[PDB]
Amino acid sequence: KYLKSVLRELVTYLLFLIVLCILTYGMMSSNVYYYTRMMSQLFLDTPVSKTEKTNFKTLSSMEDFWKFTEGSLLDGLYWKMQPDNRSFIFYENLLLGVPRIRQLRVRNGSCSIPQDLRDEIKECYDVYSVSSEDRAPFGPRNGTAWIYTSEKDLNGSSHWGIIATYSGAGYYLDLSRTREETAAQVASLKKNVWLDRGTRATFIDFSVYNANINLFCVVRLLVEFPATGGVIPSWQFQPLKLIRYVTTFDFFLAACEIIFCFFIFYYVVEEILEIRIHKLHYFRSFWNCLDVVIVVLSVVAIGINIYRTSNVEVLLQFLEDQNTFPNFEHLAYWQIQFNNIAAVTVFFVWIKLFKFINFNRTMSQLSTTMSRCAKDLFGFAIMPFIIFLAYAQLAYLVFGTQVDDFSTFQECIFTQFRIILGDINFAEIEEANRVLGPIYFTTFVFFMFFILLNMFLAIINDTYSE
Amino acid sequence: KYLKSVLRELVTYLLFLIVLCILTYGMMSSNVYYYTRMMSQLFLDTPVSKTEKTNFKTLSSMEDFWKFTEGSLLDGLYWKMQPDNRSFIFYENLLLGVPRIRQLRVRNGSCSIPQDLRDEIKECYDVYSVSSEDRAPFGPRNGTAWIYTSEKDLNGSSHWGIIATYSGAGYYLDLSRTREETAAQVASLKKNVWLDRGTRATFIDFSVYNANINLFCVVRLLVEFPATGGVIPSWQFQPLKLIRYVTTFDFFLAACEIIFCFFIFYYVVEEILEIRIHKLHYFRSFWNCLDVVIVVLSVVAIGINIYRTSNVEVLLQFLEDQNTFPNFEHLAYWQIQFNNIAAVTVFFVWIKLFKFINFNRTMSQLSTTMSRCAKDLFGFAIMPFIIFLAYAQLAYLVFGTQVDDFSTFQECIFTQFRIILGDINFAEIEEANRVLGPIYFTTFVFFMFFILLNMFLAIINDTYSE
Amino acid sequence: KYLKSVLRELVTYLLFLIVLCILTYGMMSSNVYYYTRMMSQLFLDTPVSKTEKTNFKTLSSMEDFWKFTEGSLLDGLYWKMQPDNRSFIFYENLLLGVPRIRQLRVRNGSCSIPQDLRDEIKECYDVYSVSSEDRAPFGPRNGTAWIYTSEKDLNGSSHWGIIATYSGAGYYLDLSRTREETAAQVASLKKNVWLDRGTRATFIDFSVYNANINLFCVVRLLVEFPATGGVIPSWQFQPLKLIRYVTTFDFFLAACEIIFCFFIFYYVVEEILEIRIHKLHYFRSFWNCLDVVIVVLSVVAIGINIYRTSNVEVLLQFLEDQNTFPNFEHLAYWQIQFNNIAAVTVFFVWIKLFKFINFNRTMSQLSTTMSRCAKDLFGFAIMPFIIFLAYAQLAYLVFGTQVDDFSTFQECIFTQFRIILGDINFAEIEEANRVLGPIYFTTFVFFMFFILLNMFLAIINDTYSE
């Protein structure tokens, strides 16, 4: 044995945990936040013009977008020279290739205009959708900025924005490597009207490479044009690490990764043979059910890691010709996915530690606390739950067309959580509705704590009657 | 049965609930918040002049109001042309008809000036009231902007503003359909003094119609002139949906509405026959008392819905002549009322779910809680209540002339709730009173939790003695 | 009883309560906050110059003060004419008399300069105090702005500012009734240096009278010059109500006041004979000890009210000659004192309500809670208390020279209360000290709830053992 088996399990789990911790510490670099901070400050906070005070974070119309495209964007992208034409941003960022600008359009007459308003209005444009997307040339064709390009010819993917989800095809244009030619191209796009009443989205893409610390950065600025009017901006900066095996620490990380997958295989093989006739009722105790989540997450993480390391050479064929657009979107997407999976896996492995500390005299504490008390809350706690969702629905129906925090129903849930915690924005609620606002606020705050106190009392009495 | 009856009740209630939920989902459109957001940003955030930094949200005097009326208001209302005169705001809004501006005045000498100050002051003007309202012509009569018009001749109703409630009559002027004529009219109003020391309110009204998503928007901006001086601005951006039966989904929603009123009739008829000699003591158990609130709310909602659908054609006679002012205030008012009633009804229907989940083994949980614990708080909880209102009155008497959060006594209640939750603005309280401010704050925060803890202890002891 | 006596006490107490409520409602006017709001916005928020963006609320040096005195102050005080020289601020405020500006100085050589730094520095000026105050003429005497005037000759009293308390005497100058003469006087003061290295405070006083609602307003702007450098501003706006008996409601309130003092006499006489040989042990039960506080507060409030109504005519002799400075500071001070006393009295009267609701079957509710539970917290609660003051002292010693929230030791108490509630400003603490800041924050937040919960458990266990 009893003692030897549990000690062996404890020591092997400790080795697995320390290996995983070394992996996470090694892969997670330090002082990376300031790189993205400087990029975002340069591209989103500088005013679009010297006389104006408008920036990218607060855009209002197509005129502002045009002022930004030929203004603050060109100033912060093409740096003159340090003491060749390679545009070292901040003097060591080395803008890679050329940027690209792409738009998405919809079809005219994709609506059902009421017959009453048939003499005053003769054009309509639906909200963005795959069925309403436009695929015809417009304006002076004369190139690729006025001709639809399919999602397969244009090596892209689907980007999920604030309003809707966008396909990834459309009308694109590759800008130039210098300031003058790019400015001329943008002026030509502005002259021959490019954004006119049919545009529903616009993307700007480029990448930089910092030599002092090996990291790439992909910038994807998105401006959405709703069917009502105005614009909605989004930036989404993201760093990358493509080149590996540069220092001895990288080979040490490779070694710890391979022994880590060895531990994963050892756990899965030692856990799959004991789901056999013996211990066949294996789906209980909440500890044996977690060891399958651990191995599933580890297997998918290993699959992503070995699928993401086989493309660092195929997609860096850009080193041969540094004149075209380097497409690095998929690499950033898989970085994000792998980081999320690794964080979830390490969180679960860390919280699995309770199963070993319970075998000491803690059983009378842990046991009782997690059995007689962590089980009867989950019985009668739906009363807090049903009234929470009822209040969320009431807030979404009353507010949500006037208050930004109450649109998009899930944000009602998040706003209610913040209100319970103490993050209150009562001015906007008061301004929106002067009667139901205060009533909703006071009734919610009163009844949540009322019912919580009630349930607490109930459980105390149940314990006293037990 | 016993089982069959409760199962029948459960299934019919579930059908009613799903019908109500689908109705609410269908009627509540998506991404409506951005329409009002763009309107409000255009009209309330742009500076009144290029050199100035003052906007509508922060107005200070009549000079600022005059600068706004011929400045940012005209710029954001008349758009030049897209590539006729119809003024497509943001290129997709189509300002309907012409805007209207109206004011309310009071009579000179409606005061009782003290005999001591009788040689230095010879004019006085009371605060706004129906008895003090002015009804005489002034200045160069020459039209309708200088002649009183009754609330019956001028189609309108009262509006409940920040300081007082305004009748809805007064001196109005219909602006023009173009920028030049409207600017000339506003300049003529400014020259021959039209706002002079007697004005107590000013309204601006107009409407727009977005064709991409069929929705109207009624805008009314109210500027109040208190007897003390200065101005107070307000806004009531509210969307509308007048044209229906445009998509098959609308007819599906109509079918849902008719089956919903069928369920309402079925519930009321099955509930009114059983309030008879059998179960005559029907005003208890808190569940039978809720089913009458449900039917009352449903009946009033149905009445409002069928009264609001018979005027979508009578009041849209504006389509014949698009040169006058389209009056849509009542439609917006009834939209607001119907939305509030529907939200309350669905909230109550959702919280009615507890009576069916209780018939399973949950009765021993819900029982004690709402029979021994949710009742004895309501007995001894007035001590938290009396001292809460005493503190509110103390804060209203001490503060409230220096702090905006403590004027208008109900705001003392709301501020106390926010202080308990954790939203504190202690700087202004410290600045207002340097002695009673901190004393009140610390004593309130101490004593609230003191008495709460005390009551908790009391109830625990009562449970232990029972 | 027994019944008749308690019913008589209840009915007379409710009569007293309703009389007090009508008195307070009548004396407290409505919509007074906007008057002071407009005054403060006009005088504290407008930039000192058109090119500059500095206002009174954020002043930095003597140059800024000089720019404000001849800039935004003169613009917002002398209004040109409405369509005589009387300067109706906002067109109905009627600046009364002329404003006055006064300064306080200290003596040169009131220090003890170290002998080491005796060759580089030859002047010193102590912080403000009565012993260090200067009383000699300076500059070109030529009038009263360069000659000391005693606190008795100059009708005034002390004002308790931010840094210290100021005597109320000094060098004063009465400005003019028009813009040109006042500007010339301020320019002459600026030319012949009047604020020079010895000034420790500066006051600006004036008053206005609104005719639409009978109210005065006294403004006392204070700018402090610390011995280190810079300035600290303060404004302290305060309304007044001098003229009474103007409407019938005023006479109704007078009748309410006289019947109120009748009730006060009745209570004091009925309470004073029963502290006799019978019920001689009258200093217990917490209810008989409160009825003496009630009568003391009522007597002092009546004394203040009858002392403040006999000077509304003596000090309004300014109506005879409207060319000099109207001194209204004492009236505002007594308004503040009377309002504070009345608010405290009504709060105590409201919380006295518990003794009558207790004689019903509520008596068993409050025995344990006010006899067994409200007493044993006050026994073992000094551990929350001693560690609270120890933490306050630690925060005052560590911070307080870098953070504004931790200077002036009582503000450490207030900041700790706000931190417990949830109002955190962690950025400043992090910037101040990188080690003791976070340690103090986390340790305080952990240990406060640790000890509180522990005490709760102790109270429970004791109740279970009792």
Added chain:
Amino acid sequence: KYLKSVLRELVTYLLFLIVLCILTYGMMSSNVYYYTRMMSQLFLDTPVSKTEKTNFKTLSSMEDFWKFTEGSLLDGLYWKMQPDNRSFIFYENLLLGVPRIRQLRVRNGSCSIPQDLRDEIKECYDVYSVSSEDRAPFGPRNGTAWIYTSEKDLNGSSHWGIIATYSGAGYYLDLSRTREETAAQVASLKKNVWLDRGTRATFIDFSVYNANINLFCVVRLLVEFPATGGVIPSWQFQPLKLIRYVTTFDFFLAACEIIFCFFIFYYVVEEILEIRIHKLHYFRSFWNCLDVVIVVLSVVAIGINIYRTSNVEVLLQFLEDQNTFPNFEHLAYWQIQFNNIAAVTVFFVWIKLFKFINFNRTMSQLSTTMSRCAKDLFGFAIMPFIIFLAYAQLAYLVFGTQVDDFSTFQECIFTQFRIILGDINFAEIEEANRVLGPIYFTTFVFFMFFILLNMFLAIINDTYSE
């Protein structure tokens, strides 16, 4: 013993406590915060130029730093003359000596550039470290601003900045005593490029002395240049008190300090003979173990105090020649250390008071409370603890490259504490990650209170079963 011994201990402890309180009150001056506040307002809030709106607190590039160095820095440091060349800042500060500017550089080619990117990039510079530091002359040597100076020759020590810890040596330049010469020197530094792609830090140092209250102020301005790009400003204002024994109160404080060291010696001598064969088990009861912490802290504080008073004359040899740079960094460092030690010592002495109030009938209060309740929380509380650190690690892995609250892992702990208290910044978390952000927030807030409540219940049940 019994009574006499405990009374003697109580009275001697009271004497010690009052002596310590008098010492702390005497040493801690009043209204010191405003001195540093005015300095920081003058040097960090003024815009770098009249046309620009950028200040020191928000710097972005080397151009901004150059504009600040010859702009707002020179304006706020050299004041023209009061009605000699001594530059009385704010007219009472007397800038001491001359300021000094110093930089730190790294070596070119201190990287390992990948062989793939070997044709486009030919320079690299590692992050700051002692191994990568540059020690060679550059540019036109011609003086000491272009030649490395060791830490022993350049009197100084290391400083702990935001990104890393800097050595304290480098290339320095002593500015002039007047505005013109200093401006010329800064222009010459700007012309011959002095900050160029290798600079990793820059320091600015000076000091002032206020004669009205004898206090020095050392200002150190640090600007960090990360390898990624941009700048990170950092400041430090610290008052000093070098000259003592100026008033009689100083000699009284000296007497208090000496009698305090007599009390410390008496406590240590009476405590070291009691750890003898009698009561040799001295390391229990939590009271006997704290009296050694008290004496250790007191001894180290006395050592620092007597080591810091022997250099107030050695290092003030600058009085002989007021033309060079006065180095006062070590004095400020020891002020900070002594203040921290004294605050900790007085906090511990204050919280030690519980041992004397316990000998009255309070012993039963803290029996269960401090032996049965404060002990079993520390047993089963690691579940709140392990899941707290697991959540911190998850937040650091997911966020921390996009949100500044989650970089630098300890800030994850602090942000979690603030979130629990109620200080939420949910907009940034929502913008960074749209799926794991809300999930993490809601799950953390739910599970923390879930497990806390569970443990509370466990404790209650254990108490009831014991």
